[PDB]
UniProtKB/Swiss-Prot annotation, chain F:
<comment type="subunit">
    <text>Interacts with capsid protein VP0 and capsid protein VP1 to form heterotrimeric protomers. Five protomers subsequently associate to form pentamers which serve as building blocks for the capsid. Interacts with capsid protein VP4 in the mature capsid. Interacts with protein 2C; this interaction may be important for virion morphogenesis.</text>
</comment>
<comment type="function">
    <text>Forms an icosahedral capsid of pseudo T=3 symmetry with capsid proteins VP2 and VP3. The capsid is 300 Angstroms in diameter, composed of 60 copies of each capsid protein and enclosing the viral positive strand RNA genome.</text>
</comment>
<protein>
    <recommendedName>
        <fullName>Capsid protein VP3</fullName>
    </recommendedName>
</protein>
Length: 250, 278, 238, 59, 278, 60, 59, 278, 238, 59
């Protein structure tokens, strides 16, 4: 059977008995930087199994009225294991990621989720012509919620779900790498994202490489059951990570 | 040998007959993120068709290979306000909506540029218009970042020794020129989800990576007894283009020249009901 | 010098010309190239990707996201219509803003076949059959399932495979069709009808939803680059 | 140092043109709009395991 | 080899002598729809004549290979009426009688097009004419069907990013340009005996197949203190022509630009009697 | 550049000239050709067809 | 990539010209008004059975 | 064979590992006047890097291969003062600061010259401006040292029989011309630490070696009823350049066109203290 | 004559063009060439020469020459800072007017590694050790020797060899950096600290001085020729 | 008498141009900005005795 998948990174393993195929970025597997493309001169560090392993972020609840959530990376993993320390102590960084989303429900539930990774997901403010801090869009591992109605507070991003906070049609996000979690036939989605940027390496504290979004296209529904919500969990694992430019931490 | 001698039609349709088997091309699963590769030959009987259509006009090179206006401004030959006798424009491609949207369909671009300048002049209205003036001449100055900037029409900075410049006389063909790929990075970035300072503070968005310089224009020495107004239009035409990571086209109307801010918009228009087709 | 004569068109500025011009930064050293993942060499590659179609434009959608879901019920009058729409990818409101319609709106002519994929997002225990038919151009659209079934159609059975495709063949009198379609270049209609009805066991929701995806086949093509009318401005941006 | 290449024309209905470069910078050359290679796999089939259209998508 | 090296006179006359036989070339039967192929040699004695005349100038390529005006319109640089400061012409070849008749001798045509524009300007009369204006500039915009249409001289649509355009300055040679065969069908149709709707209703005639687009013209930025009027003339010159199904030339004068309507006309002029020859 | 001199007739528009001009729709794909019956390549072919002559022009 | 061909002249009284194409689109070429082939049969003899001028048209 | 068929990237970085030996590349002695040739590979571990950067744009040919203005002056078509109707400029490169500093980075130079002239005209203000004048024409005269010098606009010296001259009409492209290496010595001298007389007396400095001649400009025959003022700008562009003995760039502002005189200037700007880095 | 058409850009004057023009002194005989010593073929050769860096810009230098000397004392509080500066070769006041900064100020982009050479100009009997460290870009510059030593650094021992070099490696996210550096293209900091302290025997001065030299490595390069802002005039010189 | 030579371009991404001289004076030719030879030894190592970087500068 091709409906069972197993992933082993470092000292962690992920097993799924109910899953679809695996999507690999734009057809490119993560890899180390080549000699003829590098620009920095000093030897890079390659923490191997210490940084390349699965790290489970906090879990969320899926209710009948949920609208969606998003996470920004690597700020989400900024304070996780040795990966966060190595980020803090280095000036330049580079790594691909493997994203796994878990969501399981009985055969009597119905719903559809869209899992998509949006590189360079620049967002606009609620009040046009008014700046926001770096807290309305990323505060560590916590998830940020979309809104059904138009956002009105000037201190946070425009959370209109149908526009996805980017001024584009929400239905056109299919262009980016993505997968669907349909409770009829699926419980997890796996995406392998290579390193995408305009430069060989970049600082991970100043730049958000990509954004992860989960949107329920078909609202959850059920009848006459004791289960009131369906938790969702997200797991991420850096791949082929290498850092350069040791400075004082922070 | 003083010479060096240096087309891909769309797929054809194959004949298909009646079928009855366990193979089911029609059924698939979109949950995999995979777009189905079925063809009409796989779900109905079809004749053999030789197709000569080609996708030549849909290439990115041709799609972006059209000159489009990016900026216009007016300056007077003579006036009391010093700042009103010359133009100073920071180079950016976000000013005009059509070209902005065309470029914003891709995340990263790498191309050469071809710049064309169209200049026109007109005499301002007044109570006394009778005068005789010879043909006017204009100077276009390009100042890379960090260079000196003129503060008036007759400033010393207009004596370019290293800054490229073009002198143009009215009545001739529009000025034209070529620019190579001049980005510090490996490709231009239409979007930048990040900050300027390392502590996640300061400027945010694509405004941080805009350091292309300035352009200045003036009348060389024309100073009419009566005011004369001139307008300049700048046209960009990418060449040898390469693109990466396509993204959905924008839906909401633009509102700022250096921000993504927008107002929520409906997905599309409505109709009477789900069955209305008239 | 060499005798010469200027022909008409000299000193003109044509926005779609191809001529050599001097370089103002001679001997400039460009940055070395890097192979960023996800290179695109033709807009058709984008056009062949699926996108959700907002079919439920019922003029009373207080919630925008409701536009993407086609309602379905348990005890449906036999042989009822599920939805109907015009096949105008570049002009109809349904396909206007999709990932495909956006690309077509930059062109004037189009040709080739299209793919419509439907996915059932109900319960795992629910079952049913649906008839999806494409009616070529005619004087009247179909009003009943008997009329609809005469044209090209496929019977969709809901099971382990949650999605089915409906290739809309390219049937036309001309090699190309106008994006701004008219009566002369009409393309037909697409409709869906109940084939058997939806049946659910006890303890399940009484309603479900369906979603539609639109994309182009490998024989699709476009022509005559033009400016899109969806975007406009009244004053210079600042 | 003159290049000779064919020019766009019909399907089945001297279709040659000559080009010479006058400037020392490659950026001054004319647009190379004669390339027609394309590959939609990167966006249409980004899956790891190859799937056959004829066989069922799952199991 | 850097070179590639790449005429049919009319028939001659053969000598014929006296004849007396059962063969009768003169008698035939027009009821068959067959045009007789007899020659003067078949009905009288003739000498041998070598003929060098050629039909080179009678080919369709040369017959239709002449530039002919198809439209003219006037627009003012400044005026109170917004609609009077620019032109908007739906492309069609039925406006001018000479070219219309020349084209209408064939049912189907397939050719490339060469378009030339002639623009002239003049100063409108008035009580005060003394003014000084630099050379004017003009913009020609082509909008394929379905594209945005400007509503005023200074509309945003004039910032063409995909629509081809030409900028021209007075005093130079007329603008010229080439257009390929841009019909959705396999050939242009001068006539269309059919309707628009499938139930035989709606528009009738060749008006149904006219979807070639529009052309717009304006002064780039010229705005004189006193009005100035300009006129533009459009010339079409088919190239690489092919024709099918010839039809008789028209006899009645044209009366509508999008219809075949006419008034009955006599077959030809009269004379005193059937024997009058003076 | 290369020295040159313009001769009389430059910048004139002759309605029967044969010159190359730029194409404003580069890389445009034309519709495939089809052999419609009844092609005409010379007006003389039309001229050689019979036609009824109105000889009886008797003014009445 | 230069074509050399004869130019129109008299009957019995260096009659060569050179042409080069500068643009990549065949629509930009000059008119090909040097073709002089013609066949009036399609309009003058559209009958099915061939008729000989010498023999009677009917019987 | 009618053809003759006629790149140096910066150094790469080699991989280096841990080291412990008596060799000490880091320590050296600047007292020898020798600049250390160490590389980052010699003091820390480094990866292998292939570098494609080139120093093409830093060559002297490109650095000095840009046209720069060297002089401008105004002259009127008609006026009471005879000396005000024409220009007389002794050739020298010390007039304009940017080009002066660019050239003064080397002691000796040897190059060909390319001279371009930009001329513009304007009508002077007055109580009555209505007039009609045809296009103006200008003459540029070059007089090697010792030749006759005109004393008025209509002097006989303007009939050049050996002195090169250029006649230019307004509305055309700017005049351009080439000059070879015309120094009596083997190379131009930007500096000359010496005197004119053998007893160390007289003129001092680079003024002694400036004997390049003069340039004269006038209106050929234009004499308007009302005054008209014209301005000329001269641009120099060295070609085929060679330089010797580089010297530090100047720090103090220039104050004289034929002397090195200056005012003492601080070495550089100040900061709060030796540790301030913010 | 030969038919021709003028393209856009004709009759324009571009200051960086390369065209042939007539010679106004035909058959002029130039003076024979002579090989003067010290030919320069590239400004980088000049850029690779050392020059004294005025580090002591203490805003109270009544004597200008004092700017070139870094003070040092005998009984220094343990682990004290000697000096600190920003690594902006083309913008910082320290490197602005040096032989290298002057060259960079004629360009817009620069890349490559740099060399800093320090020479001890104290007594022959004096001794000491110093720590010189380079800190890549970050949110905060180092404040103590413990913070400084984490980055690239070298321990300098004063002996018979009076000078030591500190190669500043090229560590950047982009292939090039702007001469008019900003927060995006920051380069870091350089600082020096006491490692052991300076010890002197009886009968010697209680203070000493150090000098710094700046130069470019063999992988340095520049780009985008521009006009320098250090020189200006208000009226024509006479 | 036409020279063919390569034109400046990228590192690993018909790169030929033709030049002809029309005037009899070499001063009329275009700038020869295609030379990239350089040698910093004259200014960086003007010492008489060669010094090795690895060995001590003195003794
Ligand atoms: C936001 N977009 C990023 C990419 N960038 C591309 C780009 C780069 C350079 C130019 N230069 C135009 C130009 C200015 C001035 C001259 C001068 F006249 F000074 F020589 C010549 C060309 C344009 C676009 C666009 C913005
Ligand atoms: C009724 N006739 C049918 C055949 N048709 C032939 C035809 C097709 C296209 C054109 N285009 C002319 C043209 C318009 C605009 C431009 C622009 F300036 F926009 F580039 C260029 C060419 C002409 C005739 C004629 C009508
Ligand atoms: C102080 N600098 C010493 C080197 N010298 C170089 C140099 C030499 C000759 C010229 N000639 C310019 C010129 C003048 C006049 C004409 C004329 F129009 F008369 F033909 C042509 C060229 C320039 C610079 C510069 C000073
Ligand atoms: C600056 C280049 C000017 C070229 C002028 C036109 C070409 C003249 C030479 C004839 C073509 C041969 C070129 C070649 O040898 O490749
Ligand atoms: C864009 C083409 C410009 C052609 C310029 C004139 C021809 C120069 C080359 C001499 C002719 C040889 C052409 C050939 O090899 O076929
Ligand atoms: C004054 C020189 C005019 C040259 C005109 C263009 C070149 C025409 C000849 C074709 C190129 C061959 C030159 C050669 O034999 O080297």
């Amino acid at each position: 059977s091709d409906r069972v998948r197993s992933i082993t990174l470092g000292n962690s393993t992920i097993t799924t008995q109910e899953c679809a195929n695996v999507v690999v970025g734009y057809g490119r597997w993560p890899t180390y930087l080549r000699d003829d493309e590098a620009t920095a001169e000093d030897q890079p560090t390659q923490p191997d199994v210490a940084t390349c392993r699965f790290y489970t972020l906090d879990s969320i609840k899926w209710e009948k009225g949920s609208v969606g959530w998003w996470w920004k990376f690597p700020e989400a993993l900024s304070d996780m294991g040795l990966f966060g320390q190595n980020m803090q102590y280095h000036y330049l960084g580079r790594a691909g990621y493997t994203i796994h989303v878990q969501c399981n429900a009985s055969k009597f539930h119905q719903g559809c989720l869209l899992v998509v990774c949006v590189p360079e997901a620049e967002m606009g403010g609620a009040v046009v012509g008014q700046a926001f801090s770096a807290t309305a869009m990323a505060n560590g591992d916590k998830a940020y919620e979309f809104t059904s109605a138009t956002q009105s507070d000037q201190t946070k991003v425009q959370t209109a779900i149908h526009n996805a906070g980017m001024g584009v049609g929400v239905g056109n996000l299919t262009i980016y790498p993505h997968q669907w979690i349909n409770l009829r036939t699926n419980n997890s989605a796996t995406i392998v994202m290579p390193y995408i940027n305009s430069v060989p390496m970049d600082n991970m504290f100043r730049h958000y490489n990509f954004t992860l979004m989960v949107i329920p296209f078909v609202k959850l529904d059920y009848a006459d059951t004791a289960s009131t919500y369906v938790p969702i969990t997200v797991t991420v694992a850096p791949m082929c990570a290498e850092y350069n430019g040791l400075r004082l931490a922070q | 040998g003083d010479v060096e001698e240096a087309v891909v039609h769309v797929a054809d349709t194959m004949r298909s007959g009646p079928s009855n088997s366990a193979s089911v091309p029609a059924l698939t699963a979109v949950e995999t993120g995979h777009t189905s590769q079925v063809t009409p030959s796989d779900t109905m009987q079809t004749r053999h068709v030789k197709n000569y259509h080609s996708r030549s006009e849909s290439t990115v090179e041709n799609f972006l290979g059209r000159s489009a206006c990016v900026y216009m401004e007016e300056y007077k030959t003579t006036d009391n306000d010093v700042n009103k006798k010359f133009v100073a424009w920071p180079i950016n491609t976000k000013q005009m909506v059509q070209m902005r949207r065309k470029l914003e369909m891709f995340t990263y671009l790498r191309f050469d540029m071809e710049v064309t300048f169209v200049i026109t002049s007109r005499q301002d209205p007044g109570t006394t218009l009778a005068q005789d003036m010879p043909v006017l001449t204009h100077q276009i100055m390009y100042v890379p970042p960090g260079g000196p900037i003129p503060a008036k029409v007759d400033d010393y900075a207009w004596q370019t020794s290293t800054n490229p410049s073009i002198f143009w006389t009215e009545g001739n063909a529009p000025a034209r020129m070529s620019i190579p790929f001049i980005s510090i990075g490996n490709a231009y970035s239409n979007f930048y989800d990040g900050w300027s300072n390392f502590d996640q503070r300061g400027s945010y968005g694509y405004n941080t990576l805009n350091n292309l310089g300035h352009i200045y224009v003036r009348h060389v020495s024309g100073s009419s007894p009566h005011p004369i107004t001139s307008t300049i239009r700048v046209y960009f035409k990418p060449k040898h283009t390469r693109a990466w990571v396509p993204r959905p086209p924008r839906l909401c109307q633009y509102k700022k020249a250096f921000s993504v801010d927008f107002t929520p918009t409906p997905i599309t228009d409505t109709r009477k009901d789900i069955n209305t087709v008239t | 010098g060499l005798p010469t004569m200027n022909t008409p068109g000299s000193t003109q500025f044509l926005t779609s010309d191809d001529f050599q011009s001097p370089c103002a930064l001679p001997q400039f050293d460009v940055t070395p190239s890097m192979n960023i993942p996800g290179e695109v060499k033709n807009l058709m590659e984008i056009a062949e990707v699926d996108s959700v179609v907002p079919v439920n434009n019922v003029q009373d959608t207080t919630d925008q996201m409701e536009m993407f879901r086609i309602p379905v019920t348990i005890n449906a009058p036999l042989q009822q219509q599920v939805f109907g729409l015009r096949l105008q990818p570049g002009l109809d409101s349904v396909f206007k803003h999709t990932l495909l319609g956006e690309i077509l709106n930059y062109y004037a002519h189009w040709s080739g076949s299209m793919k419509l994929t439907f996915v059932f997002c109900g319960s795992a225990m629910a079952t049913g059959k649906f008839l999806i038919a494409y009616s070529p151009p005619g004087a009247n659209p179909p009003k009943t399932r008997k009329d609809a079934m005469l044209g090209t159609h496929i019977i969709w059975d809901i099971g382990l495979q949650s999605s089915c495709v409906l290739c809309v063949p390219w049937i036309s009198q001309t090699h190309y069709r106008l994006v701004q379609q008219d009566e002369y270049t009409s393309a037909g209609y697409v409709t869906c009808w109940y084939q058997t009805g939806m049946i659910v066991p006890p303890g399940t929701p009484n309603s479900s939803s369906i979603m539609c995806f639109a994309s182009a086949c490998n024989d699709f093509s476009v022509r005559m680059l033009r400016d899109t009318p969806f975007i406009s401005q009244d004053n210079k941006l600042q | 140092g003159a290049q000779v290449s064919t020019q766009k024309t019909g399907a089945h209905e001297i279709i040659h043109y000559t080009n010479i470069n006058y400037y020392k910078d490659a950026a001054s050359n004319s647009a190379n709009r004669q390339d027609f290679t394309q590959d939609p796999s990167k966006f249409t089939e980004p899956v790891k395991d190859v799937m056959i259209k004829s066989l069922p998508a799952l199991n």
